[PDB]
Structures are given as C-alpha cells and as structure tokens.
Design a protein around this ligand. Structure first.
Ligand SMILES: *[C@@](O)(C(=O)NCc1ccccn1)[C@@H](Cc1ccccc1)NC(=O)[C@H]1CC(F)(F)CN1C(=O)C1CCC(F)(F)CC1
Ligand SMILES: *[C@@](O)(C(=O)NCc1ccccn1)[C@@H](Cc1ccccc1)NC(=O)[C@H]1CC(F)(F)CN1C(=O)C1CCC(F)(F)CC1
Ligand SMILES: [Cl-]
Ligand SMILES: [Cl-]
Ligand SMILES: [Cl-]
Ligand SMILES: [Cl-]
Lengths: 304, 304
C-alpha cells in the first residue's frame, strides 16, 4: 500500500547523457547509437538570441567546433545536422549502452519521468505531467537544457521531452525529440508566457480511486450523476471535460473498487463545491491531477 | 526554479538488484561484489513465521537451496551466513557493475531514495523520509521485500534501508544493510504497530526557505521569536524540538534569503496558529516536512 509520485528507474537514460560544448555555451545531449541529440541553441551566442537564423549559424560551424564528452571520454563529431529545434551531432562512437528506444510525442494530461542533468552528469529524477497548456511544472536550473523526459515499457525507453527553457511563471517548456515544441513557444528571447491552465479531470478521478484502494473513503457518497451534469460543474471550477473514453479508461479502477465512475464523479462534484472540510486524501489537502489512470494501476495493488 | 520531491538517479542501484528464491518464497536481493544481501525471512516457510529460530532454519539449509538470478543469468551460491535480519549469500560471480558504496544508518528526519523492485526487476524510484517513529511512508506491494533505499554523493552509493514489511496503518518498516531494524519492529508476525509520530520541524523550515527562493512570500512577517518560545509552540502542535544545530544548518538558506531562522520561526508559528487561510506553498496546502535543508540547497538555485 501507499501512494507516491514514482518515477521510472533512470539507469537506461543515465548511460545516454553526455555534455555538449560549442564555444562558451555548455549543455546536455542525449547519445543514442552514433547520434547526440541536443538543443540547437547550443550553437548560439548571447547576441544571436533575439532573432537568430539557425540555418545560417549552422552553416558557419564545423565539426571541430563541437565538444562532446561522455564522462571523461571525448567523442569526435563527424557530422552535424538540424531537425526543428534539435541539433543532431553524428559521432565516431556508437553508444554501447544505447537502450531499446522510441521517440514519442505525449498528450497533455500524460505523465513522464524527468532526469535532471547538468554538464552531462545526471542530478536527480522526478515525475511530471504535461499540463493542458503544454508547460511542465518541473525543477530545473541554469544548465539543465538538454535534460530529457521519458517513459519505460518492457525495457523500451520512449523519450518524449527535451528541456529548453523556463517561462516567467517558473514553469518549463521544451520539445519532443524531433525538436517540435510542446505549446506555442520558441527557442529565442521574447515575452512568451504560459497560457491559462486547467485541471486534468480524469487524473483527479484516478487519484480518488487510488485513495479508495488505500482506504480513504470519507469523500464518498451515495449519489450518482450524469456525464453531462458533471461536465457542467467541471466548467465552473476550470476542470477539463470528461469523455466517454475517460470513463472507459477508469473502468479497471471502478471494477476493483466497485465504485462506478459516475458515482465517483458525484464525489468530485461535492469536493469541488464543499471543499475538503479539513480532511486530507493520500496525504494531500488539494485535489491531485498529476497521476494518470495508468500510473494508479501500476502502483496500486489489484486487491481492494 | 521549481521544487519537486526529487530522487537520486537509480542506475548504480539497478545494476545491483537480483532475484533470490528459496523454496516457494521469492524476493529481491542486493548484489555487491560477490555477496547478495537479502531479507533473512526468504528462508522461512509460512508456518515458521510465528516465532522462527532463524539460526536453526539456516543450519538446515544448503547452498543449492538458494536460487539467485541476475536478470537471466544464474548465480551459484557458494556460501551463506546471516547478519542480524539480513542473509548474506556469497556467489561465484562478483558483480561487474558494483558501484563505490557504503552501508550507513540514517537518522529520523533524513531522506533517501527508494528503488521499488519486484522479482529482482526495478519498478520505480521515489523519495522518502525516515519518520520520527522509524517508519517510512513508502509505496510497496507484495514482493517488494529486499528493495533498498540509498543516497548518492560523488558517485558513492550510501545504502541505508532494505525493505521488510508493511505495518497495519500502511506505513513501512525495514532494516539498515547490517540487518538492524529501524524502530521497535521484528521480522515475524505480531500485532506490532507504528508508535505516535511527530512533524520534522527543521525540514518544514527548510521547505519554507525553498518557497521564499521560489517566490512564495505571503506567509512572511516582521516578527522574530526566541528559540525557547518557538519550541514551546512546537510542543502544542506535535512538532519536533528545534536545536541550535538545526539553526546552524539552516544558516546557508537564511543567508541566501536574508530571513533569519528565528524570523522564519515566527512565520511557522503563525502558520500553525492561523492555518494557511486558503493559500498554498510550493503547490501544497499542507506544511511539508520531507525535505531536509540539504535537499533544498541541492535543488534550489544559489540566487534569490
Ligand atoms: C539552457 O538553455 C538551459 O539550461 N535551459 C533551461 C533552464 C534555464 C533556467 C532555468 C530553468 N531551466 C542553457 C544553455 C546555456 C546558454 C548559455 C550559456 C550556458 C548554457 N541556458 C541557460 O542556462 C539560461 C542562462 C542564459 F545562458 F542566459 C541563457 N538561458 C536560457 O535558458 C535561455 C532561454 C531562452 C532560450 F531560447 F531557450 C535560450 C536559452
Ligand atoms: C516480502 O516480505 C515483502 O514483500 N515485504 C514487504 C511488503 C509486503 C506487503 C506490502 C508492502 N510491503 C514478501 C516475502 C514473500 C514471502 C512469501 C512468499 C513470497 C514472498 N512478503 C510478502 O509478500 C507478504 C505476503 C506473505 F507472503 F504472506 C508474507 N508477506 C509479508 O510481508 C510478511 C510480513 C512479516 C515478515 F516478518 F516480514 C515476513 C513477511
Ligand atoms: Cl530515431
Ligand atoms: Cl500492481
Ligand atoms: Cl560492506
Ligand atoms: Cl544548486
């Protein structure tokens, strides 16, 4: 029993993390087979950051401009090319520790593990959700660009996020591993800011199921609601609409607890309308929306 | 910026995790050099669990009774011995991936990362605190015994916890890597239960400093207090006493924020007496006590 924000074991990703230096700019890259993936703004100088022409900047560079370190071992760059906001650096050595992997773009509301890295050396691992406004509430400092987010399934690492920058509210923005940004952000210096966010309803419900499995039942009630009148309450409290597919995904959790989704929706409606009235759920006094139905099943027993 | 419950990268520990089978009982062990460390109750049958004589049970066993699997590779047991509640199984193969390591016992109030494991295969990683009552609020299912907790410092892994069992309130108990239990618990079936717990005051204060560094200042005030009158309030709200050494450890954080510890204590006293009045700190509506002063410094910038 118990419930924690649990990351995937990070070893398969640690053995892919390298340092990339171009000029005085230093940051992290991801080394898979004979390619190092890193944020393209490693080739930028601070002046270039207003409106750089990344294609020009790259033509003016050569292989020996790029310094790639895997621990202490130098890796020699034998090629360079750019895909969207990612630079691809081909190196002389294929990574012997390359895991089975995929580049997958994730959806708002889904979770992933983050390996915070500095100077190519991993620092910490933690769990994140892609917010509905395509930011992540991460934990990142200067030099973390190039750190990646990922999920692991049957020893295959699905990379979904590469870190690029921090927005003024302190939330974080980045790209998938094809270099395409999540959300309406650009890798240059503007006044860009996160749009308005919403709460991930299906995840709050999954979390309530987790609590029932772990013995929190005080928020439960005998009422049931319609999917339409629940959604109508959701709009008032800035919660994402709940779909029939969401109801279907919660199916396994409702089956294990014996509480049908729509009954659980009645509980959520009461918790939004009346607050938590001095009680806590799974050690939190706020409704938690960063656990997917999948995360709950993976961590909770199949019993109770 | 940002603040998350961040674990250490788990790779160095993943490469030490093995499966140990004795009879029908299967659980995890830790493979360092040519020794596999695992909970001694792997030799138990369900009957033996009332009051086993572990020394007798072990004499009646032989090396070929022990099945140790490192992934797919069999490891042959060439010796067995017992230290307190841990069994030490000497195997034919020294672990090539053994990291630099130490066995250290931690103090109540300190944190560590946990690598949840099942059948020798790592499942997840998360951060825990040793509670003042020597339990941990972990996330563990049947088959997690043998999973370890650890900290990493300059590539050296300090193992501090091996998981053994779950207590009736759903909290978790285990030993250090010398097999000595944390807290007044035994590896047998009794009515044992966690004693009463308290909140880790120095960690709450560290966390408030983290929030100030991340821009939460609403809880601040102009008042200062004496260490004696703060401690006197702490007793009323079931908070651990604050020592002058605690004040000294918070020094770096007070220096970076410019808020002296005792002023911060005045803030904590107000937050205990008046609640949080509908506001949140670092995304929590409760005072968080599972970040040490060290954890805050490691994750927060040195600026602001
Ligand atoms: C890198 O972009 C990075 O660490 N980004 C993530 C981040 C930064 C701050 C807080 C949380 N996450 C490095 C790359 C770099 C550039 C120059 C010298 C060394 C490293 N960027 C930074 O550390 C900061 C500081 C800076 F150098 F002034 C520039 N910077 C940025 O984050 C910029 C934001 C906008 C951009 F287009 F993404 C380019 C980088
Ligand atoms: C192991 O002890 C374990 O997983 N402990 C941690 C745990 C259990 C439940 C919830 C959270 N954490 C395995 C060892 C085992 C024993 C027999 C068969 C297979 C594996 N123990 C268990 O999975 C559970 C179920 C059990 F098998 F009935 C016995 N058990 C225990 O946890 C016992 C608690 C008291 C003890 F002295 F520690 C012995 C194990
Ligand atoms: Cl690819
Ligand atoms: Cl499960
Ligand atoms: Cl040792
Ligand atoms: Cl730091």
């Amino acid at each position: 029993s118990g419930f924690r924000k649990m990351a995937f074991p990070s070893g398969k990703v640690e053995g892919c993390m390298v340092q990339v230096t171009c000029g005085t700019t230093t940051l992290n890259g991801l080394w898979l087979d004979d390619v190092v993936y890193c944020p393209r703004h490693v080739i930028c100088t601070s002046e270039d950051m207003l409106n750089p022409n990344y294609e020009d900047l790259l033509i003016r560079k050569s292989n020996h401009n790029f310094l790639v370190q895997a621990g202490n071992v130098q890796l020699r760059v034998i090629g360079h090319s750019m895909q969207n906001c990612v630079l691809k650096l081909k190196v002389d050595t294929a990574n012997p520790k390359t895991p089975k992997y995929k580049f997958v773009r994730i959806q708002p509301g889904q979770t992933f593990s983050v390996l915070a890295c500095y100077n190519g050396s991993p620092s910490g691992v933690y769990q994140c959700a892609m917010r509905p406004n395509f930011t992540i509430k991460g934990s990142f400092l200067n030099g973390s660009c190039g750190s990646v987010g990922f999920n692991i399934d049957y020893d295959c690492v699905s990379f979904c996020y590469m870190h690029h920058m921090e927005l003024p509210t302190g939330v974080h923005a980045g790209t998938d591993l094809e270099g395409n940004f999540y959300g309406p952000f650009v890798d240059r210096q503007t006044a860009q800011a996160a749009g308005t966010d919403t709460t991930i309803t299906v995840n709050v419900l999954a979390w309530l199921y987790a609590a029932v499995i772990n013995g929190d039942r005080w928020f439960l009630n005998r009422f049931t609601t319609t999917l339409n009148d629940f959604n109508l309450v959701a709009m008032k409290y800035n919660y994402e609409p709940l779909t029939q597919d969401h109801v279907d995904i919660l199916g396994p959790l409702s089956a294990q607890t014996g509480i049908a989704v729509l009954d659980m929706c009645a509980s959520l409606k009461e918790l939004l309308q009346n607050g938590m009235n001095g009680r806590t759920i799974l050690g939190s006094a706020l409704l938690e929306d960063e656990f997917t139905p999948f995360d709950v099943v993976r961590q909770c027993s199949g019993v109770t």
